[PDB]
Coordinates of C-alpha atoms in Angstrom, one line a residue:
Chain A
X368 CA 28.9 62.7 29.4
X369 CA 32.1 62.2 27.1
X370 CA 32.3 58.2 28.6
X371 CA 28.3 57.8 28.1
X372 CA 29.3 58.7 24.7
X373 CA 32.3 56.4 24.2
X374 CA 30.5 53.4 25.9
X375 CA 27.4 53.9 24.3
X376 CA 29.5 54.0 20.8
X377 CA 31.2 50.9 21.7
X378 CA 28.3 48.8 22.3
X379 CA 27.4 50.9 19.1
X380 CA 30.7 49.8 17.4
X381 CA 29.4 46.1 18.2
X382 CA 26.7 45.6 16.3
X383 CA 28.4 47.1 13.7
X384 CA 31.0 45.0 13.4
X385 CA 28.5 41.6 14.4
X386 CA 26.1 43.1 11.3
X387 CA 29.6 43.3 9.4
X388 CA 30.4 39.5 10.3
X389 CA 27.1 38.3 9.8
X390 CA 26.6 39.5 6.4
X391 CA 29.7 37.9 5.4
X392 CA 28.9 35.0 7.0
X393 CA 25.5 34.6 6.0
X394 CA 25.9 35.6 2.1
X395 CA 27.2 32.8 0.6
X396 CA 24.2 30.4 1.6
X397 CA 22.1 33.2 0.6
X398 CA 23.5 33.3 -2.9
X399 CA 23.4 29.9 -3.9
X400 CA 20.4 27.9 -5.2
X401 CA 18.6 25.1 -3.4
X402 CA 18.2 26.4 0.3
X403 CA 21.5 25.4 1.2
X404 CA 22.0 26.3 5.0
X405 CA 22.8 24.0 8.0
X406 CA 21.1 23.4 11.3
X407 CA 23.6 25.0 14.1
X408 CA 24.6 27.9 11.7
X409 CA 20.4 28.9 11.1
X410 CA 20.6 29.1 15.3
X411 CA 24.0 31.4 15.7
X412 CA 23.1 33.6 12.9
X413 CA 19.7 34.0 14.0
X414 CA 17.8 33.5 10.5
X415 CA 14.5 33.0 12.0
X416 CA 13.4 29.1 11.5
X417 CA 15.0 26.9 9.6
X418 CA 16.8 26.5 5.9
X419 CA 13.8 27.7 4.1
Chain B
X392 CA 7.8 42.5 75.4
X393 CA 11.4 44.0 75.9
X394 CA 12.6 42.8 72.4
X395 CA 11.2 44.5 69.0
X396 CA 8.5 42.1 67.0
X397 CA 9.5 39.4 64.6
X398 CA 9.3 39.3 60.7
X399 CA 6.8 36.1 61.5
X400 CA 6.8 34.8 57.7
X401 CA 10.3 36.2 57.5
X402 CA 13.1 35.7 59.7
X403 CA 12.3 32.0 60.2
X404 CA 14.8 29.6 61.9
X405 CA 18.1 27.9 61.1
X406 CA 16.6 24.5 60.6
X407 CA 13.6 25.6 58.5
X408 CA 16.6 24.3 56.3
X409 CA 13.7 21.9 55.0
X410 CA 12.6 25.1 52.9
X411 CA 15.5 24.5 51.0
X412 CA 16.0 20.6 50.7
X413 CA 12.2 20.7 49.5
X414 CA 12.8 24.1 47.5
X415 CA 16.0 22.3 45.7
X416 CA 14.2 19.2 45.4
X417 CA 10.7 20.5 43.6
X418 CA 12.4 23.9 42.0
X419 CA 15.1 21.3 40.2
X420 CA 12.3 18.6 38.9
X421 CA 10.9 21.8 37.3
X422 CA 14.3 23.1 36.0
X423 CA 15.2 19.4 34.8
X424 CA 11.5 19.6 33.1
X425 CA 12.5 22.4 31.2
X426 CA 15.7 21.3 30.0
X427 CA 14.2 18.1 29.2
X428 CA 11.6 20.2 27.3
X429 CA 14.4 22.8 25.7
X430 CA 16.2 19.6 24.2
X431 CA 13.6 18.2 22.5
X432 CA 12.2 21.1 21.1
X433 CA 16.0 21.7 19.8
X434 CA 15.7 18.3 18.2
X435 CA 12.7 19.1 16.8
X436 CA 13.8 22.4 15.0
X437 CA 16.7 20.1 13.3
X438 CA 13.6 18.2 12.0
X439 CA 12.0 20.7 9.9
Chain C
X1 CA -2.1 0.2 -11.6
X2 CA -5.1 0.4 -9.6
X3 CA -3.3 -1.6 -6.8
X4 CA -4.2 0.9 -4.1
X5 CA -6.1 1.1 -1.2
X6 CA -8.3 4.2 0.5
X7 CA -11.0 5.7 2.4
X8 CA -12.6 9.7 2.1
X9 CA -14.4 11.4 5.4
X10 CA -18.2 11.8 5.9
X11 CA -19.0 10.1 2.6
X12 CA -18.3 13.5 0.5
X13 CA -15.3 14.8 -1.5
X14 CA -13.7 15.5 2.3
X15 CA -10.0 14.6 1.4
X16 CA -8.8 10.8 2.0
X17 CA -7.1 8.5 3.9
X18 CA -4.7 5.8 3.1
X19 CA -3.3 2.2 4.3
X20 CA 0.4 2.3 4.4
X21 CA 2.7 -1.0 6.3
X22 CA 0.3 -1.5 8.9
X23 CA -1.4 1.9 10.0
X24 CA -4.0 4.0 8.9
X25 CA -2.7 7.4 8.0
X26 CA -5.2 10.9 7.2
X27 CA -4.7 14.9 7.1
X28 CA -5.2 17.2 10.5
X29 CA -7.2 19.7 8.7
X30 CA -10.0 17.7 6.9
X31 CA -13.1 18.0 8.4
X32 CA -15.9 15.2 9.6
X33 CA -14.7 11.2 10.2
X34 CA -14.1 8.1 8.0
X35 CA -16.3 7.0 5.8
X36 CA -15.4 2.9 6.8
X37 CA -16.8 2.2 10.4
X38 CA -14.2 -0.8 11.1
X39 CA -11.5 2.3 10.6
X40 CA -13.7 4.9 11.8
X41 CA -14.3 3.6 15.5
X42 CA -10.1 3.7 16.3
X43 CA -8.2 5.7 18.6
X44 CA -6.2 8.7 16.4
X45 CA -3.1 10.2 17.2
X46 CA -2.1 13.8 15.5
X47 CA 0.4 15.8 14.6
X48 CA 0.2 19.9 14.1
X49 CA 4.4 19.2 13.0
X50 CA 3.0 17.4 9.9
X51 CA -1.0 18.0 9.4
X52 CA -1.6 14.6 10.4
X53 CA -3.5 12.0 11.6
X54 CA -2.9 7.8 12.5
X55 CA -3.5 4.6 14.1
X56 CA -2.8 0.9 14.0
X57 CA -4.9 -1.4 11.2
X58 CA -7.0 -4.4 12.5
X59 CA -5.4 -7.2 12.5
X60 CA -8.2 -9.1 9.6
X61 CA -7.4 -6.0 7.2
X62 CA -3.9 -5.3 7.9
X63 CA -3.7 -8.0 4.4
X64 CA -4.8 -5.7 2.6
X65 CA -2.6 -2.0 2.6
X66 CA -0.2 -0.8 0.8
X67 CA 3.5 -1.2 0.4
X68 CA 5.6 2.0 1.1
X69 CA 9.4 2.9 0.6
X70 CA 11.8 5.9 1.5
X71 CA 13.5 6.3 -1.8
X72 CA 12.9 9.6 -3.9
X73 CA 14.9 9.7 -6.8
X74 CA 14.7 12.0 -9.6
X75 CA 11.7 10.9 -12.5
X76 CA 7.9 9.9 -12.7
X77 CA 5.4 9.0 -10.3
X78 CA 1.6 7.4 -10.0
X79 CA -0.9 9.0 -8.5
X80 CA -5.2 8.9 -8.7
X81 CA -4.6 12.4 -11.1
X82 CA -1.7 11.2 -12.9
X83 CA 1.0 13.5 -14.2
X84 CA 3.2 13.2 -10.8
X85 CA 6.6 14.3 -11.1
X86 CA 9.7 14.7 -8.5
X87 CA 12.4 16.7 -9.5
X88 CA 14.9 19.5 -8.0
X89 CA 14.4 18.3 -4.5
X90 CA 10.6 19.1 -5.1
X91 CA 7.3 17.1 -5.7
X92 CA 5.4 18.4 -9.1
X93 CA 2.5 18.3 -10.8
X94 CA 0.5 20.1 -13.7
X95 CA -2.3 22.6 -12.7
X96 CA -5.3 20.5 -13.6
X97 CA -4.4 17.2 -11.7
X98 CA -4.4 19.0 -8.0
X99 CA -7.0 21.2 -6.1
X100 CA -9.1 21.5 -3.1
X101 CA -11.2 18.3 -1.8
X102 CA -8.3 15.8 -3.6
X103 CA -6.2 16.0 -0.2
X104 CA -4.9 12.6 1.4
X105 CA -4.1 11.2 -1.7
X106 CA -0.9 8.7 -1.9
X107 CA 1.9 8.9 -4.9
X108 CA 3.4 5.5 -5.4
X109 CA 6.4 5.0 -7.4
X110 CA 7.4 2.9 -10.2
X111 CA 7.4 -0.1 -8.7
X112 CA 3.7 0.2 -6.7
X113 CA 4.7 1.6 -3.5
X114 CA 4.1 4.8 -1.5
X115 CA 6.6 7.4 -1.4
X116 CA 4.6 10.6 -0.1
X117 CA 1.0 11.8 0.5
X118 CA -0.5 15.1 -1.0
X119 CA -1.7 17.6 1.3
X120 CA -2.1 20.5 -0.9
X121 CA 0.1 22.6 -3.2
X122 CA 0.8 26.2 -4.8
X123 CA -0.1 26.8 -8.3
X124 CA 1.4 27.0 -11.4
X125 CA 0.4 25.7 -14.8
X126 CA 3.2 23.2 -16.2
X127 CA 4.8 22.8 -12.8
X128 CA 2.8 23.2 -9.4
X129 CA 4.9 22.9 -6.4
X130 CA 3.1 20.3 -3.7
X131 CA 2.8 20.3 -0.1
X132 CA 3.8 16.7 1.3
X133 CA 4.7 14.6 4.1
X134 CA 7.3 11.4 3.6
X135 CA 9.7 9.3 5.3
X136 CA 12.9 9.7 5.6
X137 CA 15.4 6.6 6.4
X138 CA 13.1 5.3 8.6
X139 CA 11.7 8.4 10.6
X140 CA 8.5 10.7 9.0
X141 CA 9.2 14.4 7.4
X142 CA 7.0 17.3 6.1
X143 CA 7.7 19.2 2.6
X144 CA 6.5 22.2 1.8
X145 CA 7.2 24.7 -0.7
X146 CA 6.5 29.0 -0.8
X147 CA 3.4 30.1 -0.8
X148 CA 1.0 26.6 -0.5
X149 CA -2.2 25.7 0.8
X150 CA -3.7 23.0 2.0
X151 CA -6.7 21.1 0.1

């Protein structure tokens, strides 16, 4: 129970921290006029399709 | 019979190797299809 | 400058069609055929990438299309409505030159030639945004803005 609850919270820890990255990743474009982003960065990030 | 029965569409041969050369050869054309088809849809996502 | 060269589908206000280089070019989502049965008896092909339609001009009235280039710069533009704007990275017009039926319609630059084709647009009064397809280099794109539909 106590390592269900540890490994659960790491993989919980995960996204956390790859929500944490993305957002800093991801704002910049996001905050700048003219639908900015590149091709290979929409794909890793996941933002759906395209720059739009 | 003094022997148990056999798994008749399992338990086939060594040398029903042809399985496999044919299996390798058609299940590859399909995988090389769908990489084929994965790149140029990749392609065609960079031309939206 | 009425330099330009068309045809519309089913002989009503169906959308158009245009002559650009050497192939016929039309809309995917216009209904009915070509009004012109020289055009109208060819072999189409179609994309659902770029609402759109083509094949290769007969040879006795390939003389006769239109000139096309790739370059958009920023300023004014001709088209059958008039008004025709590009500007921000977008195509423009105001509200009363563009609605439904005037699809297919080619904008030509300064100099007489074919930049883009209207497909439809989303509304606004001094500046409608337009829905478009264009060449880029040598290789054909679709624009689009937010929030546009097709004529």
């Amino acid at each position: 129970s106590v390592a269900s609850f540890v490994l659960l919270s790491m993989v919980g820890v995960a996204v956390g921290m790859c929500m944490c990255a993305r957002r800093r990743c991801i704002t910049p474009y996001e905050l700048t006029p003219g639908a900015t982003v590149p091709f290979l960065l929409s794909l890793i990030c996941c933002i759906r399709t395209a720059k739009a | 019979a003094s022997h148990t029965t056999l798994g008749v569409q399992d338990i086939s041969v060594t040398a029903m190797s042809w399985v496999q050369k044919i299996t390798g050869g058609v299940g590859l054309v399909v995988a090389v299809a769908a990489l084929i088809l994965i790149v140029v849809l990749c392609v065609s996502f960079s031309r939206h | 400058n009425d330099c330009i060269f068309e045809v519309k589908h089913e002989g009503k206000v169906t959308g158009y069609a245009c002559l650009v280089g050497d192939k016929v070019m039309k809309p995917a989502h216009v209904k009915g055929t070509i009004d012109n049965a020289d055009l109208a008896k060819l072999a189409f092909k179609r994309s659902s990438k770029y609402d759109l339609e083509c094949a290769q001009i007969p040879v006795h009235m390939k003389s006769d299309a239109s000139k096309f280039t790739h370059e958009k710069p920023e300023g004014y533009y001709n088209w059958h409505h008039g008004a025709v704007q590009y500007s921000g990275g977008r195509f423009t017009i105001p509200t009363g030159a563009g609605k439904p039926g005037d699809s297919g319609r080619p904008i030509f630059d300064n100099k007489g030639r074919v930049v883009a084709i209207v497909l439809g647009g989303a509304n606004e009064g001094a500046r409608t945004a337009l829905s478009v397809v264009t060449w880029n280099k040598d290789i054909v794109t679709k624009i689009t803005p937010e929030g546009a539909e097709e004529w």
